[PDB]
Write an enzyme that holds these catalytic residues in place. Structure first.
Site, PDB file in Angstrom:
ATOM      1  CG  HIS E 202      -1.896   1.010   1.120  1.00 60.04           C
ATOM      2  ND1 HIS E 202      -3.117   0.924   0.545  1.00 60.04           N
ATOM      3  CD2 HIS E 202      -2.357   2.243   1.601  1.00 60.04           C
ATOM      4  CE1 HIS E 202      -3.999   1.981   0.477  1.00 60.04           C
ATOM      5  NE2 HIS E 202      -3.475   2.678   1.296  1.00 60.04           N
ATOM      6  CB  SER E 206       0.479  -2.829  -8.117  1.00 55.70           C
ATOM      7  OG  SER E 206      -0.046  -3.484  -7.093  1.00 55.70           O
ATOM      8  CE  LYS E 228      -6.800  -7.444 -16.324  1.00 51.11           C
ATOM      9  NZ  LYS E 228      -5.975  -6.232 -16.739  1.00 51.11           N
ATOM     10  CG  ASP E 229      -8.697  -8.633  -8.799  1.00 49.58           C
ATOM     11  OD1 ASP E 229      -7.987  -8.859  -9.574  1.00 49.58           O
ATOM     12  OD2 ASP E 229      -8.688  -7.726  -7.862  1.00 49.58           O
TER      13      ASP E 229
HETATM   14  C1  HEM Z   1      -0.384 -15.748   1.263  1.00 49.39           C
HETATM   15  C2  HEM Z   1       0.577 -15.262   0.069  1.00 49.39           C
HETATM   16  C3  HEM Z   1       0.350 -13.990  -0.326  1.00 49.39           C
HETATM   17  C4  HEM Z   1      -0.492 -13.092  -0.743  1.00 49.39           C
HETATM   18  C5  HEM Z   1      -1.828 -13.252  -0.089  1.00 49.39           C
HETATM   19  C6  HEM Z   1       0.018 -11.863  -1.424  1.00 49.39           C
HETATM   20  C7  HEM Z   1      -0.850 -11.089  -1.833  1.00 49.39           C
HETATM   21  C8  HEM Z   1      -0.395  -9.934  -2.624  1.00 49.39           C
HETATM   22  C9  HEM Z   1      -1.311  -8.994  -3.218  1.00 49.39           C
HETATM   23  C10 HEM Z   1      -2.741  -8.850  -3.200  1.00 49.39           C
HETATM   24  C11 HEM Z   1      -0.761  -8.221  -4.059  1.00 49.39           C
HETATM   25  C12 HEM Z   1      -1.116  -7.179  -5.086  1.00 49.39           C
HETATM   26  C13 HEM Z   1      -1.519  -7.747  -6.410  1.00 49.39           C
HETATM   27  C14 HEM Z   1      -0.590  -8.471  -7.072  1.00 49.39           C
HETATM   28  O1  HEM Z   1       0.460  -8.009  -7.393  1.00 49.39           O
HETATM   29  O2  HEM Z   1      -0.930  -9.844  -7.238  1.00 49.39           O
HETATM   30  C15 HEM Z   1       0.876  -8.802  -3.943  1.00 49.39           C
HETATM   31  C16 HEM Z   1       1.916  -8.294  -4.606  1.00 49.39           C
HETATM   32  C17 HEM Z   1       3.295  -8.588  -4.277  1.00 49.39           C
HETATM   33  N1  HEM Z   1       3.639  -9.544  -3.689  1.00 49.39           N
HETATM   34 FE1  HEM Z   1       2.486 -11.177  -2.730  1.00 49.39          FE
HETATM   35  N2  HEM Z   1       1.212 -12.256  -1.619  1.00 49.39           N
HETATM   36  C18 HEM Z   1       1.749 -13.452  -1.079  1.00 49.39           C
HETATM   37  C19 HEM Z   1       3.025 -14.031  -0.957  1.00 49.39           C
HETATM   38  C20 HEM Z   1       4.060 -13.363  -1.743  1.00 49.39           C
HETATM   39  C21 HEM Z   1       5.228 -14.039  -1.679  1.00 49.39           C
HETATM   40  C22 HEM Z   1       5.603 -15.269  -1.506  1.00 49.39           C
HETATM   41  C23 HEM Z   1       5.913 -13.232  -2.350  1.00 49.39           C
HETATM   42  C24 HEM Z   1       7.568 -13.007  -2.642  1.00 49.39           C
HETATM   43  C25 HEM Z   1       8.554 -14.334  -2.387  1.00 49.39           C
HETATM   44  C26 HEM Z   1       5.184 -12.088  -2.816  1.00 49.39           C
HETATM   45  C27 HEM Z   1       5.471 -10.854  -3.511  1.00 49.39           C
HETATM   46  C28 HEM Z   1       4.960  -9.937  -4.012  1.00 49.39           C
HETATM   47  C29 HEM Z   1       5.367  -8.668  -4.609  1.00 49.39           C
HETATM   48  C30 HEM Z   1       7.052  -8.503  -4.889  1.00 49.39           C
HETATM   49  C31 HEM Z   1       4.311  -7.792  -4.872  1.00 49.39           C
HETATM   50  C32 HEM Z   1       4.333  -6.574  -5.864  1.00 49.39           C
HETATM   51  C33 HEM Z   1       4.142  -6.988  -7.235  1.00 49.39           C
HETATM   52  C34 HEM Z   1       4.141  -5.699  -8.039  1.00 49.39           C
HETATM   53  O3  HEM Z   1       3.444  -4.909  -7.944  1.00 49.39           O
HETATM   54  O4  HEM Z   1       5.143  -5.840  -9.147  1.00 49.39           O
HETATM   55  N3  HEM Z   1       3.709 -12.142  -2.220  1.00 49.39           N
HETATM   56  N4  HEM Z   1       0.818  -9.797  -3.089  1.00 49.39           N
HETATM   57  C1  LIG Z   2      -9.826 -12.710  -0.265  1.00 53.54           C
HETATM   58  C2  LIG Z   2     -10.363 -12.217  -1.380  1.00 53.54           C
HETATM   59  C3  LIG Z   2     -11.349 -13.036  -1.966  1.00 53.54           C
HETATM   60  C4  LIG Z   2     -12.017 -12.659  -3.364  1.00 53.54           C
HETATM   61  C5  LIG Z   2     -11.327 -11.487  -4.028  1.00 53.54           C
HETATM   62  C6  LIG Z   2     -12.433 -11.031  -5.331  1.00 53.54           C
HETATM   63  C7  LIG Z   2     -12.850  -9.623  -5.235  1.00 53.54           C
HETATM   64  C8  LIG Z   2     -14.096  -9.551  -6.043  1.00 53.54           C
HETATM   65  C9  LIG Z   2     -15.288  -9.368  -4.993  1.00 53.54           C
HETATM   66  C10 LIG Z   2     -16.531  -9.299  -5.825  1.00 53.54           C
HETATM   67  C11 LIG Z   2     -17.564  -8.465  -5.273  1.00 53.54           C
HETATM   68  C12 LIG Z   2     -18.397  -7.663  -6.370  1.00 53.54           C
HETATM   69  C13 LIG Z   2     -19.319  -6.658  -5.793  1.00 53.54           C
HETATM   70  C14 LIG Z   2     -19.918  -5.580  -6.918  1.00 53.54           C
HETATM   71  C15 LIG Z   2     -20.679  -4.469  -6.273  1.00 53.54           C
HETATM   72  O1  LIG Z   2     -20.756  -4.257  -5.147  1.00 53.54           O
HETATM   73  O2  LIG Z   2     -20.958  -3.490  -7.255  1.00 53.54           O
HETATM   74  C16 LIG Z   2     -22.288  -2.981  -7.195  1.00 53.54           C
HETATM   75  C17 LIG Z   2     -23.079  -3.658  -8.342  1.00 53.54           C
HETATM   76  O3  LIG Z   2     -23.017  -5.100  -8.188  1.00 53.54           O
HETATM   77  C18 LIG Z   2     -23.586  -6.127  -8.936  1.00 53.54           C
HETATM   78  O4  LIG Z   2     -23.946  -5.542 -10.139  1.00 53.54           O
HETATM   79  C19 LIG Z   2     -23.790  -7.328  -8.609  1.00 53.54           C
HETATM   80  C20 LIG Z   2     -23.033  -8.408  -9.454  1.00 53.54           C
HETATM   81  C21 LIG Z   2     -22.794  -9.890  -8.918  1.00 53.54           C
HETATM   82  C22 LIG Z   2     -21.475  -9.698  -8.037  1.00 53.54           C
HETATM   83  C23 LIG Z   2     -20.951 -11.232  -8.205  1.00 53.54           C
HETATM   84  C24 LIG Z   2     -20.543 -11.746  -6.872  1.00 53.54           C
HETATM   85  C25 LIG Z   2     -19.281 -12.363  -7.043  1.00 53.54           C
HETATM   86  C26 LIG Z   2     -19.308 -13.779  -6.563  1.00 53.54           C
HETATM   87  C27 LIG Z   2     -18.194 -13.786  -5.173  1.00 53.54           C
HETATM   88  C28 LIG Z   2     -17.045 -14.556  -5.211  1.00 53.54           C
HETATM   89  C29 LIG Z   2     -15.763 -13.939  -4.565  1.00 53.54           C
HETATM   90  C30 LIG Z   2     -15.298 -14.862  -3.370  1.00 53.54           C
HETATM   91  C31 LIG Z   2     -22.252  -1.330  -7.695  1.00 53.54           C
HETATM   92  O5  LIG Z   2     -22.952  -1.264  -9.253  1.00 53.54           O
HETATM   93  P1  LIG Z   2     -23.373  -0.034 -10.050  1.00 53.54           P
HETATM   94  O6  LIG Z   2     -21.676   0.396  -9.723  1.00 53.54           O
HETATM   95  O7  LIG Z   2     -23.721  -0.207 -11.509  1.00 53.54           O
HETATM   96  O8  LIG Z   2     -24.392   1.010  -9.558  1.00 53.54           O
END
Ligand code: HEM
Ligand SMILES: CCCCCCCCCCCCCCC(=O)O[C@H](COC(=O)CCCCCCCCCCCC)COP(=O)(O)O
Ligand SMILES: CCCCCCCCCCC(=O)OC[C@H](COP(=O)(O)OC[C@H](O)COP(=O)(O)OC[C@@H](COC(=O)CC)OC(=O)CCC)OC(=O)CCC
Ligand SMILES: CCCCCCCCCCCCCCCCCC(=O)OC[C@H](COP(=O)(O)OCCN)OC(=O)CCCCCCCCCCCCC
Ligand code: HEM
Ligand SMILES: CCCCCCCCCCCCCCC(=O)O[C@H](COC(=O)CCCCCCCCCCCC)COP(=O)(O)O
Ligand SMILES: CCCCCCCCCCCCCCCCCC(=O)O[C@H](COC(=O)CCCCCC)COP(=O)(O)OCCN
Ligand SMILES: CCCCCCCCCCCCCC(=O)O[C@H](COC(=O)CCCCCCCCCCC)COP(=O)(O)O
Ligand SMILES: C/C=C(C)/C=C/C=C/[C@H](OC)[C@@H](C)[C@@H](OC)[C@@H](C)CCc1oc2c(O)c(OC)cc(OC)c2c(=O)c1C
Ligand SMILES: CCCCCCCCCCCO[C@@H]1O[C@H](CO)[C@@H](O[C@H]2O[C@H](CO)[C@@H](O)[C@H](O)[C@H]2O)[C@H](O)[C@H]1O
EC number: 7.1.1.8
Lengths: 125, 55, 62, 431, 385
Positions: E202, E206, E228-229
């Site tokens: 943060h 990224s 996208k995720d």
């Molecule tokens: C439970 C495992 C982990 C979680 C939940 C996690 C989660 C994340 C998330 C949410 C991001 C930002 C989006 C992305 O780039 O995918 C990130 C970025 C990053 N993570 Fe992890 N991570 C994990 C493990 C690791 C490990 C094992 C490494 C390195 C040995 C690592 C290295 C990095 C780096 C370097 C970035 C920045 C990538 C960039 O912006 O170029 N992470 N991670």
């Molecule tokens: C630890 C992380 C685990 C998951 C990471 C993935 C991140 C994506 C979460 C999806 C939340 C979507 C909410 C959209 C919203 O609030 O926008 C609302 C609209 O929401 C919708 O239209 C609902 C579509 C159905 C959502 C599908 C549920 C996803 C299935 C869950 C699986 C995840 C485990 C705002 O809409 P508006 O901007 O047009 O006014």
């Protein structure tokens, strides 16, 4: 690696007819394969900027070139996100791929080096 | 206090001497406590009962 | 009243006997506390660590 | 710096300067604001101002003479300046102001006018001169209930309670031959002055001695004059320093030169070879700072003063500064010591080798009142060069490392942490 | 201001998941992080629910997993999700790490981000190890045995540490019961570590596929990346579902369907696939002590990359030589895994030794040499003199 170091080694090769005839062609090939020009960027636009030397350099860069750099960067992220390349007539040409930031970088590097030496000078009484 | 100053000369006690003193204390204190405790219960302990009733 | 006239602190200020009286007492107290805490921490860590060593019911050499 | 001294009742001191164009003659008494009490505090400042009253100045002007007076902590001065030849007219004036017009200066019309002026002077100072006001409070708390605590300008409360009698009382107890040295600076010769003085005789309260009191003491403490309406935070912090003529007099001054003074707005100041500058310039922790090694008869103060608009990062300002001081005990470098030696010499030079005779008069008088003679610059330079890193470390381990401090500050000081936090930074943790 | 920004709790959600400024050009490789978050949650949720029907006693362990498979409603789904989930967790973490290698994510100012990541990798492997032991099959017993013994290589106190870990004379009841206790613990430590990972992520945001500043064109996390995720969340689920319901055991070992036996180590013993490369590294050193050191160093060397990369630009996108060696490394990593799955036999032993050297040489030699060469190439390929 510092640009001073890169330049020192590069100048040495560039001045030597033997090395220059051998390396430069390979380097030209490398830069074309690199493909950044197809994205509309100049090499100096690729330098990682998150460090004091680059921040100093980018600060000193004249307004007009700074606006130009910003455009090439924004245009590149957009092109890259669409998974395309720019039309050929927008590619940076070799003549245009000029080291515009380099002089500012070398200047900043020399100042920091001197400051580091002066901070650690020994005295001989 | 001059008794303190002779050893530490106006400085606080450093960790090294603290950890070092803890190790010594840990052993000295254990011996003191065990002896007092065992002496206080002289007669009730197994050792005491084992000597008398030689079984 | 003028800010240049510091109020009376005589009720807590020690006389010109030994300036390190407060210091020596202070450093001894902190040193002893540090000393006892260390012994405590060491014995607390050893208590948990040993709870993981072979239990009384499995030490049987048949 | 020619040391010429003679005694025959009155102690005469001169210092000839070929290149000069003017001369200064006057009397320096070995008493100052420290020889006062909480209630007559400001009496000396009062005497200074009546000696500079319009009436007594118009007289000196017609004779082609300029008047000077300096009220310090351990001394006071009354100097008369003139051309190289009118040296005799000067003596006639000193002989007048302290034997003849002694009453004319203390007239009801003059006293009341002077008292009203210094009253307004001291008030403007307490209202507007924040850095000096704070430095004054540093002395006030550091030496509370001790001589060196009284401000030189005196307080408003005691000032408006002062009457003509107080001046006389003080004068009879302090403006005495045994607590005086007649000074002569500029281009006047020793004999030329000694004969012009020997011309007149008399005595007027001679053979007396100044009163005695309690010994000066440093007390780790602080005084906070918070004023949220001011644009800055002004603070002075220090440890017990070195009394004038002490074995570590120079080592202490050298130590202060290492951290020196700084002015954020001046380009060259930002480039000084001071380690501390690397830490404070990034987030611009202050507008300026100045280290000092104040020396007096019984004690001294070693520390620094500073002003800042960075009211949310004062703790970092103080932290980095005190953190650098710790270094004097454990890691001051050879080249830091050498840079200080050079810069110290230069400063002592600019002080003693000033072109101005009134300065030399004050320096001369004050110095002979204490050590009988004035310190030769050549001997000072040799002592300064003799200083080593070990010397510095030994001094800091005694005076700086884990020692009590005195703090004073005014303005937006909400960000200045409690005493104990600041105090803890006087040392570093270790194994 | 909006409640999502002013509320003490929502503002955290807002800054990390809603208004968070993302580089407009980050590609799908940046979806691996959200996927690892899903994995952790999947692993924890399924583990807890199974935990309700599991018994750690060395005599009831294996049968209680069989009890979950047969008697618990949807129990086989819980177990296959957990087991296959662990595998997907590693495949995704390998891609996440590789993404980091390729795009210079480890480079300043993201060094701490990378280091905490290395911490997470280690905890994740230890967690997986502990979980596998809880099944108490043949592989579990011998895996517990071999791995705890890794510490016997520590001089002097070595054997005491192992007796302390075992809680007895060999892997037995006290070993399985504490391992299950520990298996439950670490996932929560990893989560704590993940939060630290995100905190470092943060403050710098990224990076992007171009390797240059993303400051000139950011788009909010919400909507663009939240959706996208979701794309990768569904593809991850689809593929995990394919394995869970249609091929639930192809990623495991049949020997773990045989209760652990303290007197017999199966000749068919093979570590879990994701541990194979490290297993191959250790197996390449004909010395006990040097073997464990090198294997552990294989993980720790990841920490040296920020210093061995001499490139003046971040990422491999515009670097021909770096791109080529990056794939040599990746493929060398797969080969190390295949070697691990083979027997200690003539052709394979030398290949492993050679592949082990290639693995370390990449970080210590190839990267610093190639990056230095590329710096000069970019220079002389344009500047005139
Ligand atoms: C439970 C495992 C982990 C979680 C939940 C996690 C989660 C994340 C998330 C949410 C991001 C930002 C989006 C992305 O780039 O995918 C990130 C970025 C990053 N993570 Fe992890 N991570 C994990 C493990 C690791 C490990 C094992 C490494 C390195 C040995 C690592 C290295 C990095 C780096 C370097 C970035 C920045 C990538 C960039 O912006 O170029 N992470 N991670
Ligand atoms: C630890 C992380 C685990 C998951 C990471 C993935 C991140 C994506 C979460 C999806 C939340 C979507 C909410 C959209 C919203 O609030 O926008 C609302 C609209 O929401 C919708 O239209 C609902 C579509 C159905 C959502 C599908 C549920 C996803 C299935 C869950 C699986 C995840 C485990 C705002 O809409 P508006 O901007 O047009 O006014
Ligand atoms: C065994 C355990 C496995 C578990 C892991 C499962 C999750 C796998 C994640 C895949 C991944 O990270 O690959 C990323 C690369 C990079 O891709 P890119 O440069 O960012 O994309 C440009 C897009 O076409 C933009 O295009 P788009 O408009 O966003 O749609 C893209 C595409 C995305 O498909 C996906 O699900 C992504 C893999 O949707 C389709 O058209 C597919 C229709 C069937 O995508 C590839 O090149 C894939 C080959 C490696
Ligand atoms: C302890 C250390 C662990 C680390 C070990 C590494 C983990 C093991 C590897 C597992 C898979 C990781 C594959 C590499 C990671 C993704 C690489 C990547 O980021 O590629 C980006 C690249 C093209 O993207 P560009 O942005 O450079 O395109 C230029 C646009 N102007 O995209 C490409 O070039 C195409 C991607 C081709 C991927 C083929 C991967 C082969 C993997 C074998 C699968 C293993 C199963 C047995
Ligand atoms: C990062 C999260 C986790 C990982 C990587 C992980 C990994 C593993 C692995 C590899 C196994 C053996 C799989 C098999 O072949 O059967 C396992 C088993 C097990 N895990 Fe976890 N686990 C995680 C979290 C949890 C949690 C939080 C719990 C406890 C609440 C848990 C409880 C169990 C149980 C009960 C078993 C035995 C049943 C089985 O064999 O699946 N796990 N775990
Ligand atoms: C989860 C929370 C539960 C506990 C909350 C209680 C908070 C107390 C924390 C104590 C830490 C003290 C640090 C002081 C420090 O670093 O100052 C250091 C000085 O430290 C010392 O002198 C050593 C103190 C040794 C005793 C500490 C108690 C041992 C811990 C007992 C177990 C507590 C759970 C700074 O000192 P200085 O002021 O001179 O520069
Ligand atoms: C592992 C956890 C790490 C810690 C990070 C914490 C991040 C939390 C993420 C989840 C946020 C979702 C819940 C936030 C609720 C928002 C509503 C709210 O704060 O209303 C609150 C009142 O909330 C309550 O009374 C109960 C809150 C219980 C939360 C239970 C989870 C209104 O608070 P308000 O901001 O308006 O205060 C105004 C100043 N008087
Ligand atoms: C961190 C959770 C443990 C907290 C327990 C505190 C409650 C008081 C009872 C303590 C009994 C447990 C130990 C024992 O029986 O030893 C006993 C001694 O206990 C003490 O001195 C306790 C003082 C507590 C100091 C601990 C500071 C905090 C430890 C942090 C470690 C990182 C017996 O010692 P022994 O086995 O003879 O060597
Ligand atoms: C209480 C907690 C404890 C004791 C935690 C210990 C953590 C240890 C390490 O994690 C950090 C460790 C898991 C990690 O090493 C770095 C792995 C790559 C180990 C790889 C590994 O696996 C094997 C395996 O799985 C087997 O299965 C049947 C059999 C094995 O040999 C026959 C092995 C083996 O020879 C090795 C090297
Ligand atoms: C979480 C449970 C763990 C508990 C373990 C207990 C840890 C105890 C540490 C005890 C002492 O650690 C020690 O503290 C003293 C201050 O008290 C430090 O002293 C420092 O501050 C003192 C006080 O101004 C100075 O006089 C001294 O010159 C300076 O070095 C010393 O360098 C450090 O080494």
């Amino acid at each position: 690696q510092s640009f001073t170091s890169i330049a020192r080694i590069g100048d040495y090769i560039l001045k030597s007819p033997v090395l220059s005839k051998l390396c430069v062609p390979v380097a030209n090939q490398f830069i074309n394969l690199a493909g950044y020009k197809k994205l509309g960027l100049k090499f100096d636009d690729l330098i990682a900027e998150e460090n004091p030397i680059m921040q100093t350099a980018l600060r000193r860069l004249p307004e007009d070139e700074s606006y130009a750099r910003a455009y090439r960067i924004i245009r590149a992220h957009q092109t890259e996100l669409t998974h395309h390349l720019l039309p050929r007539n927008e590619w940076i040409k070799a003549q245009e791929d000029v080291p515009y930031l380099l002089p500012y970088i070398l200047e900043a590097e020399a100042a920091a080096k001197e400051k580091d030496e002066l901070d650690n000078i020994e005295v001989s009484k | 206090s001059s008794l303190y100053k002779t050893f530490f000369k106006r400085n606080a006690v450093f960790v090294g001497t603290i950890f070092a003193g803890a190790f010594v204390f840990q052993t000295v204190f254990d011996t003191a406590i065990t002896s007092w405790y065992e002496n206080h219960n002289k007669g009730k302990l197994w050792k005491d009962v084992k000597a008398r009733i030689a079984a | 009243k003028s800010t240049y006239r510091t109020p009376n602190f005589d009720d807590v200020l020690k006389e010109n006997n030994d300036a390190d009286k407060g210091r020596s007492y202070a450093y001894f107290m902190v040193g002893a506390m540090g000393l006892l805490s260390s012994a405590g921490a060491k014995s607390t860590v050893e208590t948990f660590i040993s709870s993981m060593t072979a239990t009384a019911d499995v030490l049987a050499m048949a | 710096a020619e040391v010429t001294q003679l005694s025959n009742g009155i102690v005469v001191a001169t210092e000839h300067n070929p290149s000069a164009h003017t001369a200064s003659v006057g009397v320096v008494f070995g008493s100052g604001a420290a020889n006062e009490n909480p209630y007559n505090n400001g009496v000396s400042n009062l005497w200074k101002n009546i000696f500079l009253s319009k009436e007594n100045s118009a007289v000196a002007a017609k004779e082609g003479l300029a008047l000077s007076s300096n009220i310090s902590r351990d001394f006071q001065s009354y100097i008369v300046s003139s051309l190289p030849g009118s040296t005799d007219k000067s003596l006639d004036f000193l002989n007048q102001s302290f034997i003849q017009q002694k009453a004319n200066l203390l007239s009801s019309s003059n006293f009341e006018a002077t008292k009203k002026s210094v009253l307004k002077q001291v008030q403007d100072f307490e209202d507007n001169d924040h850095p000096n006001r704070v430095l004054e409070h540093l002395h006030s708390t550091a030496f509370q209930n001790t001589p060196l605590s009284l401000p030189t300008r005196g307080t408003l409360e005691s000032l408006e309670n002062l009457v003509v009698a107080d001046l006389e009382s003080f004068a009879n107890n302090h403006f005495l031959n045994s607590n005086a040295v007649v000074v002569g600076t500029g281009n006047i010769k020793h004999e030329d002055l000694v004969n012009s003085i020997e011309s007149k005789n008399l005595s007027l309260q001679t053979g007396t001695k100044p009163v005695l009191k309690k010994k000066a003491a440093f007390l780790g403490s602080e005084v906070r004059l918070r004023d949220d309406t001011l644009p800055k935070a002004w603070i002075s912090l220090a440890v017990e320093g070195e009394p004038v003529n002490s074995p570590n007099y120079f080592v202490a001054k050298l130590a202060a030169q290492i951290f020196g003074s700084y002015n954020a707005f001046e380009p060259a100041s930002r480039l000084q070879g001071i380690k501390l500058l690397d830490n404070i310039q990034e987030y611009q922790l202050c507008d300026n700072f100045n280290h000092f090694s104040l020396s007096y008869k019984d004690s001294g103060l070693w520390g620094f003063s500073t002003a800042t608009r960075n009211v949310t990062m004062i703790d970092d300002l103080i932290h980095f500064t005190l953190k650098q001081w710790n270094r004097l005990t454990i890691s001051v470098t050879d080249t830091e010591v050498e840079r200080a030696k050079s810069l110290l010499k230069l400063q002592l030079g600019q002080l003693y080798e000033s072109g101005n005779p009134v300065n030399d008069a004050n320096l001369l008088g004050a110095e002979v009142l204490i050590k009988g003679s004035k310190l030769s610059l050549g001997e000072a330079f040799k002592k300064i060069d003799a200083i080593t890193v070990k010397d510095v470390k030994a001094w800091a381990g005694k005076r700086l490392w884990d020692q009590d401090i005195a703090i004073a500050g005014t303005g937006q000081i909400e960000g200045l942490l409690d005493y104990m936090r600041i105090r803890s930074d006087m040392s570093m943790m270790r194994w | 201001m909006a409640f999502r920004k002013s509320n003490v709790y929502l503002s955290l959600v807002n800054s990390y998941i809603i208004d968070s400024p993302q580089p407009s050009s980050i590609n799908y490789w940046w979806n691996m992080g959200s996927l690892l978050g899903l994995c952790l949650v999947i692993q924890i949720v399924t583990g807890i629910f199974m935990a309700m029907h599991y018994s750690s006693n060395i005599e009831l362990a294996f049968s209680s997993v069989e009890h979950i498979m047969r008697d618990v409603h949807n129990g086989y789904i819980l177990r296959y999700l957990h087991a296959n989930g662990a595998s997907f967790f590693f495949m995704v973490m390998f891609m996440h790490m590789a993404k980091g290698l390729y795009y210079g994510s480890y480079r300043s100012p993201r060094v701490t981000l990378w280091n905490v990541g290395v911490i997470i990798f280690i905890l994740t492997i230890a967690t997986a190890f502990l979980g596998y032991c809880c099944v108490y099959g043949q592989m579990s017993h011998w895996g517990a045995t071999v791995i705890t013994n890794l510490f016997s290589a520590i001089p002097f106190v070595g054997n005491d540490i192992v007796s302390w870990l075992w809680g007895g004379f060999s892997v037995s009841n006290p070993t399985i019961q504490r391992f299950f206790a520990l298996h439950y613990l670490v996932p929560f430590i990893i989560a704590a570590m993940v939060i630290m990972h995100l905190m470092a992520l943060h403050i710098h945001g990224s990076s992007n596929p171009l390797g240059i500043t993303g400051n000139l064109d950011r788009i909010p996390m919400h909507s663009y990346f939240i959706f996208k995720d979701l794309v990768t969340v569904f593809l991850f689920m689809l593929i995990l579902a394919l394995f869970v319901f249609y091929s639930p055991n192809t990623l495991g070992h049949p020997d773990n369907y045989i209760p652990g036996n303290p007197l017999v180590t199966p000749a068919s013993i093979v570590p879990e696939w994701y541990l194979l490369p490290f297993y191959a590294i250790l197996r390449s050193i004909p010395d006990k002590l040097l073997g464990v050191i090198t294997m552990f160093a294989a993980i720790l060397v990841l920490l040296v990359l920020p210093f061995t990369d001499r490139s003046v630009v971040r990422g491999n996108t515009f670097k021909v030589l770096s791109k080529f060696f990056f794939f040599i490394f990746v493929f060398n990593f797969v080969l190390l895994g295949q070697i691990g799955a083979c027997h200690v036999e003539v052709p394979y032993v030398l290949m492993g030794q050679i592949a082990t050297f290639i693995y370390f040489a990449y970080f210590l030699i190839i990267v610093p040499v190639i990056s230095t060469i590329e710096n000069v190439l970019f220079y002389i390929g344009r500047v005139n003199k």
